[PDB]
């Protein structure tokens, strides 16, 4: 065949830390369908927002928003435990159906997005050009986000170990752990990946007695 219908830009959702995670790649032939399981970013989360994005940038905010919806009634559970199946399906007429379903509770929500939505030919070409012109910056942002998400979880896991250990943790040690938690917290707000990893290292270096308990 010398012609066919494709979806012209990647399609996906926003995931933890402000990144676009792709479910259908640019230039995929239509009709097509893809599903992927996701989970919750923090402990006890009862809801997620599925923000539907079109484009090639790694920052969710730099992509075209096609719509959004919430899924709620998830039983509050530890981060990473809920199994939320997200499905993008584009039919032969370019209509995009997105659904999210929480496996445990069975709760599901969906939206339908018309084929005329999204970026036009000029904006499609500008998106591919802008993505390439910013390829290194976007790679650096993705790595930063990965590191931030790891430190964010190290803040939460460490703090709970402090709780559980209670009196079994020497006051000297709680002191040093507390200050390193605050320094990690501050670093996570910045954009320097090595600074964050360094505060993670400093925190490990005062958590050894906590490690053993």
């Amino acid at each position: 065949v010398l012609l066919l219908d494709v979806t012209p830009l990647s399609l996906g959702i926003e995931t933890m830390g402000g990144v676009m995670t792709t479910l259908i790649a640019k230039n995929t032939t239509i009709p097509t369908k893809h599903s992927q399981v996701f989970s919750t970013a923090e402990d006890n989360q009862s809801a997620v927002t599925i923000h539907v994005l079109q484009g090639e940038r790694k920052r969710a905010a730099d992509n075209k928003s096609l719509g959004q919806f919430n899924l709620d009634g998830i039983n509050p559970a530890p981060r990473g435990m809920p199994q939320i199946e997200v499905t993008f399906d584009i039919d032969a007429d370019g209509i995009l159906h997105v659904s999210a379903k929480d496996k445990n509770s069975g709760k599901e929500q969906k939206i339908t997005i018309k084929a005329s939505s999204g970026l036009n030919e000029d904006e499609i070409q500008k998106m591919v050009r802008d993505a390439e012109a910013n390829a290194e910056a976007d790679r650096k942002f993705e790595e930063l986000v990965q590191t931030r998400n790891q430190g964010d979880h190290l803040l939460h896991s460490t703090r709970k170990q402090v709780e559980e250990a209670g009196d079994k943790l020497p006051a000297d040690d709680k002191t040093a752990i507390e200050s390193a938690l605050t320094a990690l917290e501050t670093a996570l707000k910045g954009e320097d990946k090595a600074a964050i990893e360094a505060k993670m290292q400093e925190l490990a270096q005062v958590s050894q007695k906590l490690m053993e308990i």
């Binding site: 959702i13 995931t15 933890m16 996701f38 989970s39 919750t40 997620v48 599925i50």
Partner: peptide, 7 residues
């Protein structure tokens, strides 16, 4: 496995 934030 990616994670989705709350609304």
């Amino acid at each position: 496995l990616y994670a989705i934030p709350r609304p």
